[PDB]
Every structure is written in structure tokens, then in C-alpha cells.
Coordinates of N, CA and C in Angstrom, one line a residue:
Chain A
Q1 N 194.2 134.0 115.3 CA 194.1 132.5 115.5 C 195.5 131.9 115.0
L2 N 195.9 131.0 115.8 CA 197.2 130.2 115.4 C 196.9 129.1 114.5
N3 N 195.7 128.8 114.2 CA 195.2 128.0 113.0 C 195.1 128.7 111.6
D4 N 195.4 130.1 111.8 CA 195.3 130.8 110.4 C 196.5 131.1 109.9
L5 N 197.5 131.9 110.5 CA 198.4 133.0 109.9 C 199.5 132.2 109.4
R6 N 200.0 132.8 108.3 CA 201.1 132.3 107.6 C 202.0 133.3 106.9
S7 N 203.3 133.1 106.5 CA 204.2 134.3 106.2 C 203.6 134.5 104.7
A8 N 204.5 135.5 104.0 CA 204.4 136.0 102.8 C 204.7 135.1 101.7
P9 N 204.3 135.1 100.6 CA 204.7 134.5 99.4 C 206.0 134.7 98.9
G10 N 206.9 133.6 99.2 CA 208.1 133.8 98.7 C 209.2 133.9 99.8
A11 N 208.7 134.3 101.1 CA 209.7 134.4 102.2 C 210.2 133.4 102.7
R12 N 209.5 132.1 102.6 CA 210.2 130.8 103.1 C 210.5 129.9 101.8
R13 N 211.5 129.3 101.7 CA 211.7 128.2 100.8 C 212.2 126.9 101.4
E14 N 212.4 125.8 100.6 CA 212.1 124.6 101.2 C 213.3 123.7 101.1
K15 N 214.5 124.1 101.0 CA 216.0 123.2 101.0 C 215.9 121.9 100.1
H16 N 216.2 122.0 98.9 CA 216.2 121.0 98.1 C 217.2 119.9 98.5
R17 N 216.7 118.8 98.5 CA 217.4 117.5 99.0 C 218.1 116.8 97.8
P18 N 219.4 116.7 97.8 CA 219.8 115.9 96.6 C 220.0 114.6 97.0
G19 N 219.6 113.7 96.0 CA 219.9 112.2 96.3 C 218.5 111.6 96.3
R20 N 217.6 112.0 95.8 CA 216.1 111.3 96.2 C 215.5 111.2 94.8
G21 N 215.0 110.1 94.4 CA 214.2 110.1 93.1 C 215.0 110.3 91.8
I22 N 214.2 110.3 90.8 CA 214.6 110.9 89.6 C 213.9 112.0 88.8
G23 N 212.5 112.2 89.5 CA 211.7 113.1 89.1 C 212.1 114.5 89.6
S24 N 212.8 114.5 90.6 CA 213.1 115.7 91.4 C 214.2 116.5 90.8
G25 N 214.9 116.2 90.0 CA 216.0 116.6 89.3 C 217.4 116.6 89.8
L26 N 217.6 116.3 91.0 CA 218.8 116.3 91.9 C 219.4 114.7 92.0
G27 N 218.5 113.6 91.4 CA 218.8 112.3 91.9 C 220.0 111.7 91.1
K28 N 220.5 111.0 92.0 CA 221.7 110.0 91.7 C 223.2 110.8 91.7
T29 N 223.1 112.1 91.6 CA 224.4 112.8 91.8 C 224.4 113.9 92.6
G30 N 223.3 114.9 92.5 CA 223.3 115.9 93.5 C 223.8 117.3 92.8
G31 N 223.9 117.3 91.7 CA 224.6 118.4 90.9 C 226.1 118.5 90.9
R32 N 226.7 117.4 91.1 CA 228.1 117.3 91.1 C 228.6 116.8 89.7
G33 N 228.4 115.9 89.0 CA 228.5 115.5 87.8 C 229.1 114.2 87.6
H34 N 230.2 114.0 87.2 CA 231.0 112.7 87.3 C 232.2 112.7 87.8
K35 N 233.2 111.7 87.8 CA 234.5 111.4 88.4 C 235.3 112.6 88.4
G36 N 236.0 112.8 89.3 CA 237.0 113.9 89.3 C 237.1 114.4 91.0
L37 N 237.6 115.7 91.0 CA 237.9 116.2 92.4 C 236.9 116.7 93.0
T38 N 236.2 117.6 92.2 CA 234.8 118.3 92.7 C 233.5 117.4 92.6
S39 N 233.8 116.1 93.0 CA 232.7 115.0 92.9 C 232.8 114.0 94.1
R40 N 233.6 114.3 95.0 CA 234.0 113.4 96.0 C 233.8 114.2 97.4
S41 N 233.9 113.2 98.6 CA 233.7 113.9 99.8 C 234.8 114.7 100.2
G42 N 234.6 116.0 100.2 CA 235.7 117.1 100.5 C 236.7 117.1 99.3
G43 N 236.0 117.6 98.3 CA 236.5 118.0 97.0 C 236.7 119.4 97.0
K44 N 237.6 119.9 98.0 CA 237.8 121.3 98.0 C 239.0 121.7 97.5
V45 N 238.9 122.5 96.4 CA 240.1 123.2 95.7 C 240.6 124.3 96.7
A46 N 241.8 124.5 97.1 CA 242.3 125.5 97.9 C 242.1 126.7 97.3
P47 N 242.0 127.9 97.9 CA 241.6 129.1 97.3 C 242.9 129.7 96.9
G48 N 242.9 130.3 95.7 CA 244.1 130.7 95.0 C 244.7 129.9 94.1
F49 N 244.5 128.6 94.6 CA 245.4 127.7 93.6 C 244.8 127.6 92.1
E50 N 245.8 127.6 91.2 CA 245.4 127.6 89.7 C 245.7 126.4 89.1
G51 N 246.4 125.5 89.5 CA 246.6 124.2 88.9 C 248.0 124.1 88.8
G52 N 248.9 124.8 88.9 CA 250.4 124.8 89.0 C 251.1 125.9 88.3
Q53 N 250.3 126.7 87.5 CA 250.8 128.0 87.2 C 251.0 129.1 88.5
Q54 N 252.1 129.9 88.2 CA 252.3 130.6 89.3 C 251.2 131.8 89.6
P55 N 250.6 131.6 90.9 CA 249.3 132.3 91.1 C 249.7 133.8 91.2
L56 N 248.6 134.7 91.2 CA 248.6 135.9 91.4 C 249.3 136.6 92.5
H57 N 249.0 136.0 93.5 CA 249.5 136.6 94.8 C 251.0 136.0 95.2
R58 N 251.7 135.5 94.2 CA 253.1 135.3 94.3 C 253.8 135.8 92.8
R59 N 253.3 136.5 92.0 CA 253.9 137.1 91.1 C 254.2 138.7 91.3
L60 N 253.3 139.2 91.9 CA 253.2 140.7 92.0 C 254.3 141.2 93.3
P61 N 254.8 142.4 93.2 CA 255.6 142.8 94.3 C 254.8 143.3 95.5
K62 N 255.3 142.8 96.8 CA 255.0 143.7 97.8 C 255.3 145.1 97.8
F63 N 254.4 146.1 98.3 CA 254.7 147.4 98.3 C 254.2 148.2 99.3
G64 N 253.6 147.5 100.3 CA 253.1 148.1 101.5 C 253.9 148.9 102.5
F65 N 253.3 149.5 103.5 CA 253.9 150.1 104.6 C 252.6 150.8 105.3
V66 N 252.8 150.2 106.6 CA 251.6 150.7 107.7 C 252.1 151.6 108.7
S67 N 251.7 152.6 108.7 CA 252.6 153.8 109.4 C 252.9 153.5 111.0
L68 N 251.9 154.1 111.9 CA 251.2 153.5 113.0 C 250.2 154.5 113.4
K69 N 250.4 155.8 112.6 CA 249.7 157.0 113.2 C 248.3 157.2 112.7
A70 N 247.7 156.3 111.9 CA 246.3 156.4 111.4 C 245.4 155.5 112.4
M71 N 246.2 154.8 113.6 CA 245.5 154.4 114.5 C 244.8 155.2 115.6
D72 N 245.3 156.5 115.6 CA 244.7 157.6 116.4 C 243.8 158.5 115.6
Chain B
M1 N 167.1 100.9 56.1 CA 167.3 101.9 57.0 C 168.8 101.9 57.5
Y2 N 169.7 102.4 56.8 CA 171.0 102.6 57.3 C 171.7 103.8 56.7
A3 N 172.3 104.8 57.4 CA 172.5 106.1 56.8 C 174.2 106.0 57.3
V4 N 175.0 107.0 56.7 CA 176.2 107.3 56.9 C 176.4 108.8 57.4
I5 N 176.3 109.0 58.7 CA 176.6 110.6 59.1 C 177.9 110.7 59.6
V6 N 178.2 111.9 59.7 CA 179.5 112.2 59.9 C 179.6 113.1 61.1
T7 N 180.0 112.8 62.3 CA 179.8 113.4 63.6 C 181.0 114.3 64.0
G8 N 182.1 113.5 64.1 CA 183.3 114.3 64.7 C 184.7 114.1 64.1
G9 N 184.5 114.2 62.6 CA 185.5 114.0 61.8 C 185.8 112.5 61.6
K10 N 184.7 111.8 61.6 CA 184.6 110.5 61.2 C 183.3 109.9 61.1
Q11 N 183.1 109.0 60.3 CA 181.6 108.5 59.9 C 181.3 107.1 60.5
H12 N 180.0 107.1 60.6 CA 179.3 105.8 61.3 C 178.6 105.1 60.5
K13 N 177.8 104.0 61.1 CA 177.1 103.1 60.3 C 175.8 103.0 61.4
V14 N 174.8 104.0 61.1 CA 173.8 104.2 61.9 C 172.5 103.5 61.3
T15 N 171.9 102.5 62.4 CA 170.6 102.0 62.0 C 169.8 102.0 63.4
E16 N 168.6 102.6 63.2 CA 168.0 103.3 64.3 C 167.6 102.6 65.6
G17 N 167.8 103.2 66.6 CA 167.7 102.9 68.1 C 169.0 102.9 68.7
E18 N 170.1 102.6 68.2 CA 171.4 103.1 68.2 C 171.9 103.8 69.5
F19 N 172.2 103.2 70.7 CA 173.0 103.7 71.7 C 174.4 103.6 71.2
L20 N 174.8 105.0 70.9 CA 176.0 105.2 70.1 C 176.7 106.3 70.7
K21 N 178.3 105.8 70.8 CA 178.9 106.9 71.4 C 179.7 107.8 70.6
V22 N 179.8 109.0 70.7 CA 180.2 110.1 70.0 C 181.2 110.9 70.8
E23 N 182.4 111.2 70.4 CA 183.1 112.3 70.9 C 182.4 113.7 71.4
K24 N 182.8 114.3 72.2 CA 182.1 115.2 72.9 C 181.6 116.5 72.1
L25 N 180.3 117.0 72.3 CA 180.0 117.9 71.5 C 179.0 118.8 72.4
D26 N 178.9 120.1 72.0 CA 178.4 121.3 72.7 C 176.9 121.1 72.9
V27 N 176.2 120.6 73.6 CA 175.1 120.5 73.8 C 174.6 120.0 75.1
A28 N 173.2 120.4 75.8 CA 172.9 119.8 76.9 C 172.4 118.5 76.9
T29 N 171.9 117.8 77.8 CA 171.3 116.5 78.0 C 169.7 116.6 77.8
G30 N 169.4 115.9 76.9 CA 167.8 115.9 76.5 C 167.3 116.7 75.3
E31 N 168.3 117.2 74.7 CA 168.1 118.0 73.3 C 168.3 117.3 72.3
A32 N 167.5 117.7 71.1 CA 167.5 117.0 69.7 C 168.6 117.5 68.8
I33 N 169.1 116.6 68.1 CA 170.2 116.9 67.3 C 169.9 116.4 65.8
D34 N 170.2 117.4 65.0 CA 169.9 117.1 63.6 C 171.2 117.0 62.8
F35 N 171.6 115.8 62.2 CA 172.7 115.6 61.3 C 172.4 115.8 59.8
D36 N 173.0 116.8 59.2 CA 172.9 117.2 57.8 C 174.2 117.0 57.0
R37 N 174.8 116.0 57.4 CA 176.1 115.3 56.9 C 176.1 113.9 56.6
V38 N 175.0 113.5 56.0 CA 174.6 112.1 55.7 C 175.1 111.9 54.2
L39 N 175.7 110.8 54.1 CA 176.4 110.3 52.6 C 175.9 109.1 51.8
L40 N 175.0 108.3 52.4 CA 174.4 107.5 51.7 C 173.1 107.0 52.5
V41 N 171.9 106.9 52.0 CA 170.8 106.6 52.6 C 170.2 105.2 51.9
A42 N 169.9 104.3 52.7 CA 169.4 103.0 52.0 C 168.1 102.7 52.9
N43 N 167.2 101.9 52.0 CA 165.8 101.8 52.5 C 165.4 100.5 51.9
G44 N 165.2 99.3 52.8 CA 165.0 98.0 52.2 C 166.1 97.4 51.3
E45 N 165.8 97.7 49.9 CA 167.0 97.6 49.0 C 167.4 99.1 48.3
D46 N 166.5 99.9 48.4 CA 166.4 101.1 47.7 C 167.6 102.1 48.5
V47 N 168.7 102.0 47.7 CA 169.8 102.8 48.2 C 170.4 103.8 47.3
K48 N 170.5 105.0 47.8 CA 171.2 106.2 47.0 C 172.4 106.5 47.7
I49 N 173.2 107.0 47.0 CA 174.5 107.7 47.8 C 174.6 109.2 47.2
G50 N 175.3 110.0 48.1 CA 175.4 111.3 47.9 C 176.7 111.7 47.1
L51 N 176.4 112.4 45.8 CA 177.5 113.2 45.2 C 177.5 114.2 46.3
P52 N 178.6 114.8 46.9 CA 179.2 114.8 48.2 C 178.2 114.4 49.2
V53 N 177.1 115.3 49.4 CA 176.0 115.1 50.3 C 174.8 115.0 49.8
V54 N 174.1 113.9 50.1 CA 172.9 113.7 49.6 C 171.9 114.5 50.2
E55 N 170.9 115.0 49.3 CA 170.0 116.0 49.5 C 168.9 115.8 50.3
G56 N 168.5 116.7 51.1 CA 167.2 116.5 51.9 C 167.3 115.7 53.2
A57 N 168.3 114.6 53.1 CA 168.0 113.7 54.1 C 168.5 114.2 55.6
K58 N 167.9 113.9 56.7 CA 168.3 114.3 57.9 C 168.2 113.2 58.6
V59 N 169.3 113.1 59.9 CA 169.2 112.3 61.0 C 168.7 112.7 62.2
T60 N 167.8 112.4 63.1 CA 167.5 113.2 64.4 C 167.9 112.4 65.5
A61 N 168.8 112.8 66.3 CA 169.4 112.2 67.5 C 169.2 113.0 68.7
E62 N 169.2 112.4 69.9 CA 169.2 113.2 71.0 C 170.1 112.5 72.1
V63 N 170.7 113.3 73.0 CA 171.7 113.1 73.9 C 171.4 112.3 75.1
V64 N 171.6 111.0 75.4 CA 171.4 110.4 76.6 C 172.2 110.9 77.7
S65 N 173.6 111.0 77.7 CA 174.3 111.3 78.6 C 175.8 111.9 78.1
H66 N 176.4 112.3 79.2 CA 177.9 112.6 79.0 C 178.7 111.7 80.0
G67 N 180.0 111.4 79.7 CA 180.7 110.5 80.6 C 182.2 110.6 80.2
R68 N 183.0 109.9 80.6 CA 184.5 109.9 80.4 C 185.1 108.6 80.6
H69 N 185.3 107.9 79.3 CA 185.6 106.4 79.3 C 187.1 106.2 79.2
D70 N 187.8 105.8 80.1 CA 188.9 104.9 80.3 C 189.9 105.1 81.5
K71 N 190.7 104.4 81.6 CA 192.0 105.1 82.2 C 193.2 104.5 81.6
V72 N 193.8 105.1 80.5 CA 194.9 104.6 79.7 C 196.2 105.4 80.4
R73 N 197.2 104.5 80.4 CA 198.5 104.9 81.0 C 199.6 105.3 79.9
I74 N 200.5 106.2 80.2 CA 201.7 106.5 79.6 C 202.7 106.3 80.2
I75 N 204.0 105.7 79.8 CA 205.1 105.7 80.1 C 206.1 106.1 79.2
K76 N 206.9 107.0 79.4 CA 207.9 107.3 78.5 C 209.3 107.2 79.2
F77 N 209.8 105.9 78.9 CA 211.0 105.5 79.5 C 212.2 105.3 78.5
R78 N 213.3 105.6 78.8 CA 214.5 105.4 78.2 C 215.5 104.6 79.1
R79 N 215.9 103.5 78.3 CA 216.9 102.6 79.4 C 218.2 103.3 79.3
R80 N 218.8 103.0 80.4 CA 220.4 103.4 80.7 C 220.5 104.9 80.7
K81 N 219.6 105.7 80.8 CA 219.8 107.2 80.6 C 219.2 108.0 81.6
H82 N 218.6 107.5 82.5 CA 218.2 108.1 84.0 C 216.8 109.0 83.6
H83 N 215.9 108.4 83.1 CA 214.8 109.1 82.5 C 213.5 108.3 82.6
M84 N 212.5 109.0 83.1 CA 211.2 108.2 83.0 C 210.0 109.0 83.6
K85 N 208.9 109.0 82.7 CA 207.8 109.9 82.9 C 206.6 109.4 82.6
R86 N 205.7 109.6 83.6 CA 204.4 109.0 83.6 C 203.2 110.0 83.3
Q87 N 202.0 109.8 83.0 CA 200.9 110.6 82.7 C 199.6 109.7 82.7
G88 N 198.5 110.2 83.0 CA 197.3 109.6 82.9 C 196.4 110.2 81.8
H89 N 195.4 109.5 81.6 CA 194.5 110.2 80.5 C 193.1 109.6 80.4
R90 N 192.2 110.2 80.5 CA 190.7 110.0 80.3 C 189.9 110.7 79.4
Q91 N 189.4 110.1 78.2 CA 188.9 110.9 77.2 C 187.4 111.2 77.5
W92 N 186.9 112.4 77.3 CA 185.3 112.7 77.3 C 184.6 111.8 76.1
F93 N 183.4 111.7 76.2 CA 182.5 111.0 75.1 C 181.1 111.6 75.4
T94 N 180.3 111.3 74.4 CA 178.8 111.7 74.4 C 177.9 110.6 73.9
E95 N 177.3 109.9 74.7 CA 176.4 109.0 74.3 C 175.0 109.4 73.8
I96 N 174.7 109.1 72.7 CA 173.3 109.7 72.0 C 172.6 108.5 71.5
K97 N 171.5 108.8 70.9 CA 170.4 107.7 70.5 C 169.7 108.4 69.2
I98 N 169.7 107.5 68.2 CA 169.2 107.8 66.9 C 167.7 107.5 66.9
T99 N 166.9 108.5 66.6 CA 165.4 108.4 66.4 C 164.9 108.8 65.3
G100 N 165.9 108.5 64.1 CA 166.4 109.4 63.1 C 165.5 109.1 61.7
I101 N 166.1 108.2 60.8 CA 166.3 108.2 59.5 C 165.1 108.7 58.6
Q102 N 165.6 109.9 57.9 CA 164.7 110.4 57.0 C 165.3 110.6 55.5
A103 N 164.6 109.7 54.6 CA 165.1 109.7 53.4 C 164.9 111.1 52.6

């Protein structure tokens, strides 16, 4: 019966909508907090950026070499 | 004829005939109840009080019905702090009737 069947308990969840009500828990901010960068539209911190300290991938020396012959 | 019986952690002013509302007790509908927790018994003018409980005296009552009287509301609100919470409540009761007083 197509009127009958349904999936397993826990297999589907329901995509919490931020910004509705006060009882739901996510209202009026959506889990972001207050003023700042990670609170605005496109508050993306660039990956690897530290804040102005010299990052890891620009303090350590290059040391590789890729031969050619492990391609065969 | 007035007694002071103690039903549910509180006492009453019972003079017979008594459509009287009590908090809910564990008995069916149409059964007789004896109250052995009577504190003073008066008759005409003849009035005696119990050192804690007066001896021998009983009040016979029987259950008319059960029900649930009210609908009270609860609002826990805090201004300016993004918090509000509501809840309903209806309390059980038991209407009895005294066919009682025994000195």
C-alpha cells in the first residue's frame, strides 16, 4: 500500500529553518551571534588566514621533488 | 450540627447536605466515605473540641462525581531578553456530599 509505508526511525531529518519564532531556538539570529564578520552576508574568513600573524604555509621551507617515474 | 473534617491537607466547615468540592481522592463514584479526622463537633449549642482529634465522631460522605475545574493560564515573560513561555493547567477535583454528622 502506498498509503502505508514509511522509512526507518532516524533516517530522515527535517532541516531546521533559522529565523522563525522564539520557541524554536533559532529565532532572530540563526546561530550567528552578534556584530562582527561572521555575522553578515558572506562572512567568509579566507582559509589559512590567521589574522596577520605569518601563516603556517608561509613559514616552513619548500622541500619537495616529483620525479616523473612513479607515473608508470 | 457543624463539624471540622480534614480532607486533603486542609479543613472545612461542613453542615449536612453539603455539595462540597474536595481535591481528588482514590475512590469510585457512589461509594461511602468515613472521615475520622474531625476536630470539633457542635450540636445546637452543645459544642466540644478535640484534644487533637475528638473521640468517636464520624462524618459519612459519598461521592457525587469527578470533574476538572478551570482553565488557568501561565505566561513566563521577560522583557527585553527574548524569552516567553506558556503553559495551561486544569486541576482535578471531587464533588462529595455529606450525609454525615455523628457526635
